[PDB]
C-alpha cells in the first residue's frame, strides 16, 4: 503493498525534528542576510608590479583586452579590462597593473589569451618583463607565439588531457555547490544567494525524505523497531540515507525571479510534512533518522557533487576575507547550538511529567503531616498509618524494591527534654557509632547480632543535614515482609527498643516507578532529632529517567560525544593561539573565556557519561536479587540533576553570545559599545553603593539590641525606615546564614531606586558614542 498509511494517530509532539528544522531555517535566514551585504559590496599575487610592455611586433591596431590566467592551489583569475591611455594604438604596448587577488604559486602554469577587436593582432608579444615583485607566480620568459582567433597560447610559468581538464580546475570549487558559497568568481550569474537557497532547499528535502520514509512507508515487515537495532548496522542508517538521497535528488537539478518563491514554499511544506509525520516517533527512530540525514548529507558532499562537475583602493579586500571567516564562525556556532539544544531539550515531556509526579508523591505521602512533626517517637504510628498502606496497598504504587531504614546511634546518649527553651538548631553534637551490636540493644553476647554494622558504600553520599552530614551507613533494617508481616516487624522493633535512645535521624527512603510516564523517582525522608523529644523533618523526591549505556546509542550519548569533540577542538584552537603569541596574554577575555567555555563543555559531557554509567551499574546490581537488597538509586537521581543544570548553563551562555552578535547591524552597534566603555564607572558606582550599604547595615544591626516593641522615635527613625518588611520579613528567618548572596539581591529589589544612578552614566556615554559615529 500500500505504502502511504495515514500518519498522526495520536497528539504527542517530538521536539527533535522541530528543533533541527528551526535551526536549519534560522541559519539560512542569517546566512542570506550576510550574503546580501557581501554580494552588494563586491558587485564591482598572480602577477607582479612591473611593466607588461610588448613592442616586438607591429600591425596590431585593435581596441581589445588581454587575459592572464594563473591557476594553482585554490587560486585563479580571468582577464583584466582596465582603463589605460594607449587604448591599443597602431603598434603600441598595453602595459598596466590589475586588481587580481589570485595568490598563485611559482609553478609552470600560466595562460595568455590575446583577443582581437575585429582584425587579429599580428604583433608578437613575448611576455611581461617581471621577475619578483610581490609573489613572483611566473617568470619573464619570451613566447611571442600566435594562437587561434581570440585564443590563448598555452604555456608554463588539443588532446583529451586539455579539452575539459580545464573545467576540472575551473568548476572544481564552483559547480560543487557546498564549498562554493564563498568561492564564486565574478562575472557569474549566481548572485551568491541562489547557491545558498538551492542547498538549503536540498538539505531540507533530505530531512523531509528521511522523515517520510521513517514515518509512512515502513511496510517491509515494518522495517524498524521490531527488527531494527538503534546502533547503525551500515544498513539501517547508511543504506536508507543513500536511497532517500537518490529518490529525490533529481529535483535539485530540475530547480537548478519568480521560480524562487516556490522554493521557499517547497521548503515550508517539506518542514511541515516532516513535523506532521514526526510526531509518532519512538526515541530510537529519531536518533536513527538524525544519523540517516547526516549520512545522506555526507554522501552528497563527497561522492556526488564532485561527480556532477563532469557535465580605499587596497582595503576593499579585507572585508571579503572578514566575511568569509564570519561564515565559518556562523556555521560552527549553529552546529554547537544545535548540539546543546538537543542535549538539554530532548525530554521536555518528561520534565512536565516529572514535576507532576513529584507533586503527587509528596501530596499522597501526607507531606503536611510529616513536616508537622512534634517529637521523635510518634513516627511509628506515622509509618503504621500512611507508609505501610502506601507501600503494600493494592493501589497505584509500583515500588520496584522493598524499602529500608538506616538510623544513627551516635555511641552516646542525650540529656532529657529541655525545660522551657530547647536547643537552638543542632546543639549537643558528639560522635557517631560504627561498631557492631546485638538484638534488642547494643550488646553482643555471642557474636554478630541482628543489629549489624551496615558499613557505608560508595554511592549517593550525604545530604547536608540539620545536625551533621552522614554519607551512606547506619542501622540497616530491611523492614521487608511485604504481604502482612511488615507491621509485625515494626511492632517487634518498637517493643525491643531498636532506636529508642541515642538516635539522631531515621533516614527512610525506598523508591518509585511511574509505568505510564516512563520516569522513576527516588524518595528520601529524614527525621533528624536535635534533642531527645522534639524532632525535625526533611523529605526530598527526585524524579529521573533511568537510561543506561547498555541501551545502545541513545540521544544523550550522541550529544555527549559531540560535546566532547567540540571541547577538544576548542581546546586545541585556543592552545594554538596561546602558544603562537607566547606569554602575557592577560587582562582580556581571551583565556578566561575560552578556557571556561571548554570547562563547561567538557564537564557537561563528563557528568552525563558518569550518570549513564552509574545508572547501568545500579540497574545491573538490582537485577541480581529483588527480594534481597535495596540498591539505593538515590545517587543516580543526583547526577542527572547536575547534568541538566550544566547543560542549561551552557545554553544560557550561547544565547547571551547571540545578543552580542547583533552589533553587525550598523545602527545597532552602539548598544554593545556603550556597555563596554562604561564598565569602570559602573564598577565604581557599585563599590560606593556596597560600602554605604555595609555601613548602614552595621549601624542597623548594632542599633537595636533591645527588643522593646515601642515607638523609640530617636532610635526608630533609623532602624524602622524599611524594616516593616526588612526586619523579619525580607530574609531574617534563616537566609542570613544559609544564603548570604540572596540577601543582597533581596535588598537591591527593595532599594531599586539607587540603581537608577547608572542612568546618569550610561546616558552620557551613549550620547558620546552618537557624536563619533555620525559626524566623523
Amino acid at each position: 503493498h500500500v505504502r502511504f498509511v495515514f500518519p498522526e494517530p495520536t497528539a504527542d509532539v517530538n521536539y527533535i525534528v522541530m528543533l533541527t528544522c528551526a535551526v536549519c531555517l534560522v541559519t539560512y535566514m542569517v546566512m542570506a542576510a550576510i550574503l546580501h551585504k557581501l554580494d552588494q559590496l563586491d558587485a564591482s599575487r598572480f602577477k607582479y608590479e612591473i611593466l607588461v610592455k610588448t613592442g616586438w611586433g607591429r600591425g596590431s591596431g585593435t581596441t581589445a583586452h588581454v587575459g592572464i590566467m594563473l591557476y594553482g592551489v585554490d587560486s585563479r583569475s580571468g582577464h583584466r579590462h582596465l582603463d589605460g591611455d594607449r587604448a591599443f594604438h597602431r603598434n603600441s604596448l598595453d602595459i598596466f597593473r590589475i586588481a587580481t587577488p589570485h595568490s598563485l604559486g611559482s609553478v609552470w602554469k600560466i595562460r595568455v589569451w590575446h583577443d582581437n577587436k575585429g582584425l587579429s593582432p599580428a604583433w608578437f608579444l613575448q611576455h611581461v618583463i617581471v621577475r619578483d615583485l610581490q609573489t613572483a607566480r611566473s617568470a619573464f620568459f619570451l613566447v611571442n607565439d600566435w594562437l587561434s582567433v581570440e585564443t590563448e597560447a598555452n604555456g608554463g610559468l588539443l588532446r583529451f588531457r586539455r579539452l575539459l581538464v580545464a573545467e576540472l580546475q575551473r568548476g572544481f570549487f564552483d559547480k560543487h555547490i557546498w564549498l562554493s558559497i564563498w568561492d564564486r568568481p565574478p562575472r557569474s550569474r549566481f548572485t551568491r544567494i541562489q547557491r545558498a537557497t538551492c542547498c538549503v532547499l536540498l538539505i531540507c528535502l533530505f530531512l523531509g525524505a528521511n522523515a517520510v520514509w521513517y514515518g509512512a512507508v515502513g511496510d517491509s515487515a515494518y522495517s524498524t523497531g521490531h527488527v531494527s537495532r538503534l546502533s547503525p548496522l551500515s544498513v539501517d542508517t547508511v543504506a536508507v540515507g543513500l536511497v532517500s538521497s537518490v529518490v529525490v535528488y533529481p529535483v535539485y537539478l530540475a530547480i537548478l525571479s519568480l521560480a524562487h518563491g516556490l522554493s521557499l514554499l517547497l521548503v515550508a511544506v517539506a518542514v511541515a510534512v516532516s513535523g506532521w509525520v514526526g510526531a509518532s516517533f519512538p526515541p530510537g527512530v529519531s536518533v536513527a533518522w538524525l544519523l540517516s540525514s547526516s549520512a545522506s548529507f555526507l554522501a552528497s558532499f563527497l561522492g556526488w557533487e564532485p561527480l556532477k562537475v563532469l557535465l580605499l583602493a587596497k582595503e576593499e579586500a579585507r572585508k571579503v576575507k572578514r566575511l568569509h571567516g564570519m561564515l565559518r564562525s556562523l556555521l560552527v556556532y549553529m552546529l554547537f547550538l544545535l548540539v546543546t539544544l538537543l542535549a538539554s531539550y530532548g525530554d521536555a515531556s518528561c520534565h512536565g511529567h516529572a514535576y507532576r509526579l513529584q507533586s503527587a508523591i509528596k501530596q499522597e505521602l501526607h507531606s503536611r503531616a510529616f513536616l508537622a512533626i512534634t517529637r521523635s517517637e510518634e513516627l511509628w504510628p506515622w509509618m503504621a498509618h500512611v507508609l505501610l498502606p502506601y507501600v503494600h496497598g493494592n493501589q497505584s504504587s509500583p515500588e520496584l524494591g522493598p524499602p529500608r531504614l538506616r538510623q544513627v546511634r551516635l555511641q552516646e546518649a542525650l540529656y532529657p527534654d529541655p525545660p522551657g527553651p530547647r536547643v537552638h538548631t543542632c546543639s549537643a553534637a558528639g560522635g557517631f557509632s560504627t561498631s557492631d551490636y546485638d538484638v534488642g540493644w547494643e550488646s553482643p553476647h555471642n557474636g554478630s547480632g541482628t543489629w549489624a554494622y551496615s558499613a557505608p558504600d560508595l554511592l549517593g553520599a550525604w545530604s547536608w543535614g540539620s545536625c551533621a552530614v552522614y554519607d551512606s551507613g547506619g542501622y540497616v533494617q530491611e523492614l521487608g515482609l511485604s504481604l502482612e508481616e511488615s507491621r509485625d516487624r515494626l511492632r517487634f522493633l518498637q517493643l525491643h527498643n531498636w532506636l529508642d535512645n541515642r538516635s539522631r535521624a531515621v533516614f527512610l527512603e525506598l523508591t518509585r516507578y511511574s509505568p505510564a510516564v516512563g520516569l522513576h523517582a527516588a524518595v528520601t525522608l529524614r527525621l533528624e532529632f536535635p534533642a531527645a523529644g522534639r524532632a525535625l523533618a526533611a523529605l526530598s523526591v527526585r524524579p529521573f529517567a533511568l537510561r543506561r549505556l547498555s541501551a545502545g546509542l541513545s540521544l544523550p550519548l550522541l550529544t555527549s560525544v559531540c560535546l566532547l569533540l567540540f571541547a577538544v577542538h576548542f581546546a586545541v584552537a585556543e592552545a594554538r593561539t596561546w602558544h603562537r603569541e607566547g606569554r602575557w596574554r592577560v587582562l582580556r577575555l581571551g583565556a578566561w573565556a575560552r578556557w571556561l567555555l571548554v570547562a563547561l563543555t567538557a564537564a557537561t559531557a563528563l557528568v552525563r557519561l558518569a550518570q549513564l554509567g552509574a545508572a547501568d551499574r545500579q540497574w545491573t546490581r538490582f537485577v541480581r536479587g529483588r527480594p534481597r537488597r535495596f540498591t539505593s538509586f538515590d545517587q543516580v537521581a543526583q547526577l542527572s540533576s547536575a547534568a541538566r543544570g550544566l547543560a542549561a548553563s551552557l545554553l544560557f551562555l550561547l544565547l547571551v553570545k547571540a545578543a552580542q552578535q547583533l552589533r553587525f547591524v550598523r545602527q545597532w552597534s552602539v548598544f554593545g559599545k556603550t556597555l563596554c566603555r562604561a564598565l569602570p564607572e559602573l564598577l565604581g558606582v557599585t563599590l560606593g553603593l556596597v560600602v554605604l550599604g555595609v555601613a548602614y547595615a552595621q549601624l542597623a544591626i548594632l542599633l537595636v539590641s533591645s527588643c522593646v516593641d515601642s515607638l523609640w522615635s530617636v532610635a526608630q527613625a533609623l532602624l524602622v525606615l524599611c524594616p516593616g518588611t526588612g526586619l523579619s520579613t525580607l530574609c531574617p528567618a534563616e537566609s542570613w546564614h544559609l544564603s548570604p548572596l540572596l540577601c543582597v539581591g533581596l535588598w537591591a529589589l527593595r532599594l531599586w531606586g539607587a540603581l537608577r544612578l547608572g542612568a546618569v552614566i550610561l546616558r552620557w556615554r551613549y550620547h558620546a558614542l552618537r557624536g563619533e559615529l555620525y559626524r566623523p
Binding site: S344, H351, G352, A354, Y355, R356, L357, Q358, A360, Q363, E364, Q395, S396, W464, S514, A516, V517, R644, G645, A647, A648, S649, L651, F652, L655, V656, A658, A659, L662, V665, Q667, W668, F671, T674, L675, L682, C731, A733, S735, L738, S739, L741, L742, V744, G745, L746, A748, L749, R750, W752, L755, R756, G758, A759, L762, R763, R765, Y766, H767, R770
Partner: protein, 322 residues
C-alpha cells in the same frame, strides 16, 4: 464538545448520569455509584454540570466543575461559573441597547466602505502610516465580533427545547463558550478604539513634540528590545530547566515568564526558590536583579533621552532661525 482542561483537552464523550430533582434520589444514585466502584485507576477526568436562573435579574448562570486525575497520581480541580442573558428583550433599556447595536453595525459598515473607497486607487501602498493598520485591525475585530454575536444569538434552540419539558438536562456549554469568546473580542476592540485617540491630539507645539519623539524613538527601541527579549528568554529557559521540577512557580515556560515579570514588581517569594538549589539559586536571582535594574532598564532611558533631546534641538534650531 472539547474542553481544554489543565493537563489535556478532553473530548465530549464518556460515561454519564443525569441526576434527580430531589436530594434523596440523587443521594441514592451517588451511593449506588460509589458502591459498585465507578472511579478506578483507569479514570482520567470527571465533570459536573448544572445551571440556575434567578428571575429577579434576568440572567442565567452556568456552572461546570472539573476534576482531573493525571496518570502520575493526584487530583487537579477547576471550576467555571458563567452568567448569560438569553431573554434579552424584556425591558425598555434592552430595546435601547438593541438600537445602539444597530447603530454600531451601521458605523462599522461606514468605516469599511470608507476604507475600501480609499484603498482602491488612492495610495495603493497605504501601509506606511501605522494608523491604517490600526483602522484595519479595528474593523476586522469588529466584524468578527458581529459575526460571533449573530451566530450565537440567532439560535437558542437549546433553551426552546428545554422549555418543552423541564425534567431534562439543559445543555448551555456552547453558549457560555461563545459568550466568553465574544467578551474577549469586544474588550480587545474597545482597547484599540481607545488607543486610536492619539491620532487627533496634536493641538499645540507640545503634543507634536512628544508624538515626533515617540515615532523617532520606536525604531531603535525595537532594535534594543530584541536584545532585551533574548536575554529575558535566556534567563527564563535556565529557570525552567533548573527549578521547573520542584518550585511550581517555574513548572511551565510561560509561568517562568510570568514569574520573571513579577520579580520586577517585587512580588517574589524567596522562601521556596532558595532551597530548590543551594547554588545557582541565589546566583540566578541576584544576577537577574542587577542586570535587569542596573543595566537594561537604564539603556532604554539613554535611548529615549537622546532622541527627545535631539528632537527638541532640531525643532529649536529650525525655528527662530528662518
Amino acid at each position: 464538545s472539547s474542553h481544554w482542561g489543565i493537563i489535556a483537552t478532553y473530548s465530549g464523550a464518556g460515561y454519564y448520569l443525569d441526576l434527580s430533582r430531589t436530594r434523596e434520589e440523587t443521594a441514592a444514585q451517588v451511593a449506588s455509584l460509589k458502591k459498585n466502584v465507578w472511579l478506578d485507576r483507569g479514570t482520567r477526568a470527571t465533570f459536573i454540570d448544572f445551571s440556575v436562573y434567578n428571575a429577579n435579574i434576568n440572567l442565567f448562570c452556568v456552572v461546570r466543575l472539573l476534576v482531573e486525575f493525571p496518570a502520575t497520581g493526584g487530583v487537579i480541580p477547576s471550576w467555571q461559573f458563567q452568567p448569560l442573558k438569553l431573554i434579552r428583550y424584556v425591558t425598555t433599556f434592552d430595546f435601547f441597547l438593541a438600537a445602539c447595536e444597530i447603530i454600531f453595525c451601521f458605523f462599522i459598515f461606514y468605516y469599511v466602505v470608507e476604507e475600501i473607497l480609499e484603498i482602491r486607487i488612492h495610495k495603493l501602498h497605504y501601509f506606511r502610516s501605522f494608523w491604517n493598520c490600526l483602522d484595519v485591525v479595528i474593523v476586522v475585530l469588529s466584524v468578527v465580533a458581529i459575526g460571533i454575536n449573530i451566530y450565537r444569538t440567532s439560535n437558542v434552540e437549546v433553551l426552546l427545547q428545554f422549555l418543552e419539558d423541564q425534567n431534562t438536562f439543559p445543555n448551555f456549554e456552547h453558549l457560555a463558550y461563545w459568550q466568553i469568546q465574544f467578551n474577549n473580542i469586544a474588550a480587545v476592540t474597545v482597547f484599540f478604539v481607545w488607543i486610536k485617540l492619539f491620532k487627533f491630539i496634536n493641538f499645540n507645539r507640545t503634543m507634536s513634540q512628544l508624538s515626533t519623539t515617540m515615532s523617532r524613538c520606536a525604531k531603535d527601541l525595537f532594535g534594543f528590545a530584541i536584545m532585551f527579549f533574548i536575554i529575558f528568554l535566556a534567563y527564563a529557559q535556565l529557570a525552567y530547566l533548573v527549578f521547573g521540577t520542584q518550585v511550581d512557580d517555574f513548572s511551565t515556560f510561560q509561568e517562568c515568564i510570568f514569574t520573571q515579570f513579577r520579580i520586577i514588581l517585587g512580588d517574589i517569594n524567596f522562601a521556596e526558590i532558595e532551597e530548590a538549589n543551594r547554588v545557582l539559586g541565589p546566583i540566578y536571582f541576584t544576577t537577574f536583579v542587577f542586570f535587569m535594574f542596573f543595566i537594561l532598564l537604564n539603556m532604554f532611558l539613554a535611548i529615549i533621552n537622546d532622541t527627545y533631546s535631539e528632537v527638541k534641538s532640531d525643532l529649536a534650531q529650525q525655528k527662530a532661525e528662518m
